[PDB]
From a paper:
Multiple Salmonella serovars have a rhamnose moiety in the O-antigen that can be acetylated at the 2- and 3-hydroxyl groups by F2GtrC proteins. This acetyl group is then transferred to the SGNH domain, which catalyzes specific carbohydrate O-acetylation.
Two disulfide bonds are seen in the structure and were verified using mass spectrometry. The SGNHext interacts extensively with the SGNH domain covering 1,500 Å2 of the SGNH domain, including interactions with helix α8; 38 amino acids of the SGNH domain interact with 32 (of 48) residues in the extension.
Residue numbers in the entry: 380 to 640
The structure:
């Protein structure tokens, strides 16, 4: 039905608009500053990382607007550029190390109240060995603390991932069983992400920063959240894992009060 008709997920979900592509996501530094992506006011929440970090913007914006909060949002994100100093290239063939040097320099300039970070743990320029990944994050943490000693640093952990595009997993369930799946499910759910979330829950707080489990916010004993309504416009992920607007909104409804007291 409606789920089977979504065959081009990036066009259907307006994926560029979702991440603020061409404005704050995957842009040159002079464009980022001119477009107002780096705020200098009080109560500034400064997002850094790859497209998983960009996907947080919608839910945080919605939480602030719904609460009538005076908090503001900065964003320096780029596809295939985690907030880790790894010698790889982003989607525009730029140096991931150069991009992270520029992010640290802007954090130093504006002294934000909060730095909010995440990445795609299985992505091209991620770090696959969990212990070496903690060591790489420790280098970023030390640079942020030196640049802006009063900033709170918050790592929002990995979101749930699926074995194909989530809309295709739901279409597959309907074709096999001719029944709508449950709201929370393990059908088509990737088993590795829970292991990353558990490792970070145990080890990140000892590094002198805050950890928020996105996985525990979106998952329960029945599995992980597929949707907040009937049809493709209400599912939680664009592809295997990048949050839709409804997915991002649900996450921040759950975790926003851990960021804004």
């Amino acid at each position: 039905g409606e789920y089977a008709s979504v065959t081009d997920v990036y066009n259907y979900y307006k994926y560029g608009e979702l991440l603020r592509g061409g404005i704050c996501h995957s842009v040159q530094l002079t464009a980022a500053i001119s477009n107002g992506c780096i705020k200098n006011g009080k109560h500034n929440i400064f997002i850094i990382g790859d497209s998983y970090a960009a996907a947080l913007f919608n839910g945080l914006s919605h939480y602030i607007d719904n609460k009538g909060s005076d908090y503001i949002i900065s964003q320096m994100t780029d596809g295939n550029a985690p907030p880790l100093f790894v010698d790889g290239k982003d989607d525009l063939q730029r140096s991931v190390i150069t991009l992270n040097n520029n992010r640290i320099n802007e954090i130093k300039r504006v002294q934000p109240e909060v730095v909010l970070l995440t990445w795609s743990v299985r992505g091209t320029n991620g770090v696959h060995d969990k212990k070496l990944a903690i060591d790489a994050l420790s280098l970023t943490i030390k640079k942020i603390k030196e640049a802006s000693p009063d900033s709170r640093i918050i790592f929002i952990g990995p979101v749930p991932e699926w074995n194909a595009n989530l809309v295709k997993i739901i279409s597959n369930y309907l074709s096999e069983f001719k029944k709508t799946p449950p709201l929370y499910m393990t059908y088509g759910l990737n088993s590795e992400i829970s292991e990353w979330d558990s490792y970070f829950s145990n080890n990140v707080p000892k590094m002198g920063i805050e950890y928020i489990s996105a996985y525990k916010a979106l998952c329960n004993e029945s599995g992980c959240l597929t949707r907040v309504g009937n049809g493709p416009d209400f599912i939680t992920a664009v592809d295997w894992g990048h949050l839709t607007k409804p997915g991002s909104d649900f996450l921040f409804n759950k975790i926003g009060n851990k960021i804004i007291k």
